[PDB]
């Protein structure tokens, strides 16, 4: 449904 | 069933200068098909796999290869880039993408997948950069891809199950351009030079071919570039095209059958008119394409534009059965000649 | 001041300065009076080339008004004893001693540019004090002179009566008279 | 002092000296006056510029009184060993080294400002010692005066007559004159 | 010393000389003598800021007593040639060179501080020598002079007449009087 995609 | 003299014969109808790629991927190819039909039935079991590395210049031809044996192969085939590839979970991408694309040329593939080929392009981009997600940490992930082992993936995407496929057995191609390698295997080898007065200037920038210097290329040079020596040790089969060359440039309009040439030849023969393509005007587009630093790649444009005249007003005009082509026409200060 | 140039290479961007950049060719610069400082220098220089690799050509370019014998006499001995072919090139002047390390370079690697000049004459010296102590420094600049001709002709294949004569006084020898001479193998007109 | 600049690439932002930025694109700086030290220095920066492009037209913009002639003779030579055209420019003044150089340039690609100028004279030079000694360097600085008057009137186009009276004595040249002596192609007035 | 300064951006954050960050935004200083060294490197400033952007106006701020006039003359042709327009501004004092320049800026952005001083004279020279050498030295500094009066007239605006009268002799000008002069356009006396 939703991606919660974060990188540092 | 087919054997390295048979696929070179192939192979040179679709390409042309580069006699020594055409026998390190024929025995290769051959040997590695071998491996699939005889399996591990013999008294060796667990048979090595035996990968392929190219180095040449850009629009050398490198895709060519691995096209055409595509198709008389019959084999499914890939054509990924590893400029986008990062590092195992930042925002570029994964690898894991690439498992997926092979399989969507069939979409179903359990024991047929395995024997595909895949290519890779751009390979010097992630050289390790020594001042990571770009540099040395990708060539880390890829060591146990090439080396074999299954990925779940999804069959057509949907069940609640996954597939395992094999890549021991799929080959692979890492495909590139290394520019500047040169000066790195010229100390080494053959001088120390291009700086000092009785030193060697880099006079033959296109006099003479740095291909001969890549034939002398040994894995250690590959370091020095930023390769991880692991990395190179599981592609030991090594390719080098040498240079492209002007009068190819006029044979590859020619000898394939496949030509740009004789697509337009066939175009009009159903229509009833000849076409015509003299050697003064094929000249003319070799000079263009090495200006614009680009090879084969940037033949269709010139073409094209040359032609967009002639072809919107063939069909309007009549009784038309020939048409010339000029080396001043390729300029633009001329029109092509018309014959009725 | 000392221009910085960035050396473009796969691993990544790195500033060098121009006598830098040019080392790493293996190439070194002899500028100005031949001094004890400046001597060393160039020593280390020729040292650190020979254990990175001892079968490439070195070039040595050489522009000098000339100076201390015995610091000159320690890159001579220098460039014997090293394996590499020290190859040599006369910039502008190459005076007595400047032209002593231009001779002794490698046979067939010497160059002179059309324009160059070469000066050679005797050893220059001086003492004050006791007649005892003068008569020893005579007798040391003489075994120097003598033995600057020996190597001399050595290298340029003249005869060593020849080099005695020829130094008495100051000689100035154009390009094309030191090839005919033996003291270059060639001139470096156009690049070719 | 030297002020820093940016230069903004796609690898990143990196920091250099206003004269080292003007050397990644073939420019080099003539100031002062011209000796061994600043001339071997210009030297390794046309054999750097050689190396990364040798199509590529170089410029050279001379501002300097002279000086020392063997020092401005090793980069003569050079401009015509390598094979990239030398383009020179007159900034401020040139004098009799100075204005040497100008016209060794490639012909066709020589320029002077609107209100630059030029000084041409003979050589200078002097001893003290023994009558033996004058003499031979004296026929030395006449050589390199005839020399250095056969170069002018090559790329001058001039003949070595006219040179030989013009020398003779201090000559300025203003911008328009030296057009009209062959000295330089043209003017720079403003960019087109 | 020179303070160094933090250049907040969004890329990261950046160590600056005070100088080279009004070079970031197109500001130039003259301070001290005019010499060939100095005038060399603001040359070298001009030409860099023309590259990155040449539409936009360049400041040139002039505290100077003057100096060698080849050195000012080499400032003022690059003034004409680039297409920005180099605005001029007097802090402290304007010197016969210094106020050659000043006036050659781009009419309409001239300035002058309230309490600044503007001063103009005669070139000033000299020589040692034989009479014909003397004849010849003095005859090239009266076409300065008169150049010089040539141009100070196009860019004030006043007659060449004038300007010969006026620089006879050291005259110093107040800021009011500059503007009445043609020299200036205005005077900066508050940040409206
Ligand atoms: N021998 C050849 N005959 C016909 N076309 C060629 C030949 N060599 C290269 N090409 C052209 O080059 C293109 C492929 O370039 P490619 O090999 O992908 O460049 P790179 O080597 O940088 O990957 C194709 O469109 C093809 O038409």
Redesign the pocket.
Same mark, same amino acid.
């Given at each position: 449904x939703x991606x919660x995609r974060x990188x540092x | 069933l087919p054997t390295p003299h048979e696929i070179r014969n192939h192979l040179d109808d679709?390409?042309? %200068?580069?006699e020594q790629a055409k026998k390190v991927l024929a025995v290769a190819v051959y040997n590695h098909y071998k491996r699939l039909r005889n399996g591990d039935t013999s008294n060796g079991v667990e048979l090595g796999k035996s990968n392929i590395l190219?180095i040449?210049?850009?629009?050398?031809?490198?895709?060519?290869?691995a096209?055409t044996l595509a198709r008389l192969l019959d084999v499914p085939f890939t054509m990924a880039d590893a400029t986008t590839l990062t590092e195992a979970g930042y925002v570029g991408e994964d690898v894991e993408n690439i498992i997926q694309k092979l399989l969507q040329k069939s979409d179903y593939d359990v024991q047929k997948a395995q024997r595909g080929i895949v290519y890779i392009?751009q390979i010097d981009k992630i050289s390790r950069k020594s001042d990571d997600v770009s540099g040395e940490g990708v060539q880390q992930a890829l060591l146990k891809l090439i080396e074999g082992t299954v990925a779940a993936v999804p069959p057509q995407g949907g069940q609640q199950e996954f597939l395992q496929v094999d890549t021991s057995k799929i080959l692979f191609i890492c495909?590139?351009?290394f520019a500047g390698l040169d000066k790195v295997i010229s100390h080494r080898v053959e001088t120390g030079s291009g700086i000092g007065f009785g030193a060697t200037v880099k006079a033959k920038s296109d006099k003479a071919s740095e291909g001969e210097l890549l034939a002398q290329v040994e894995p250690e040079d590959l370091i020095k570039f930023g390769l991880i020596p692991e990395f190179i040790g599981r592609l030991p089969v090594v390719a080098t095209?040498n240079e492209?060359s002007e009068e190819?440039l006029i044979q590859?309009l020619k000898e394939?059958k496949?030509?740009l040439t004789k697509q337009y030849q066939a175009l009009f023969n159903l229509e009833g008119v000849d076409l015509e393509f003299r050697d003064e005007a094929l000249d003319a587009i070799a000079k263009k394409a090495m200006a614009r630093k680009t %090879?084969?790649?940037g033949?269709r444009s010139i073409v094209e534009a040359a032609l967009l005249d002639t072809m919107y007003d063939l069909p309007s005009m009549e009784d038309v059965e020939k048409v010339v082509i000029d080396e001043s026409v390729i300029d633009g200060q001329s029109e092509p000649l018309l014959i009725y | 001041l000392v221009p910085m140039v960035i050396e473009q290479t796969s691993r990544g961007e790195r500033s060098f300065d121009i006598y830098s950049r040019l080392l790493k060719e293996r190439v070194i610069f002899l500028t100005g009076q031949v001094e004890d400082h400046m001597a060393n220098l160039i020593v280390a220089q020729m040292l650190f080339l020979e254990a990175e690799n001892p079968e490439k050509d070195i070039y040595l370019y050489i522009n000098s008004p000339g100076g201390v014998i015995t610091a000159g006499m320690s890159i001579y001995d220098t460039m014997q004893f090293i394996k590499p072919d020290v190859s040599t090139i006369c910039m502008g002047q190459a005076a007595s001693m400047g032209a002593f390390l231009l001779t002794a370079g490698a046979k067939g690697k010497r160059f002179c540019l059309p324009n160059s000049r070469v000066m050679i004459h005797q050893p220059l010296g001086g003492y004050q004090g006791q007649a005892t102590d003068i008569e020893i420094h005579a007798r040391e600049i003489l075994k120097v002179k003598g033995r600057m001709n020996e190597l001399m002709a050595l290298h340029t294949g003249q005869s060593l009566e020849q080099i005695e004569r020829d130094t008495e006084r100051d000689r100035f020898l154009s390009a094309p008279e030191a090839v005919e001479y033996g003291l270059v193998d060639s001139i470096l007109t156009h690049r070719n």
């Open positions: - | 679709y390409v042309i %200068g580069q190219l040449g210049p850009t629009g050398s031809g490198k895709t060519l290869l096209e392009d495909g590139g351009a095209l492209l190819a590859i394939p496949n030509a %090879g084969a790649r033949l | -």
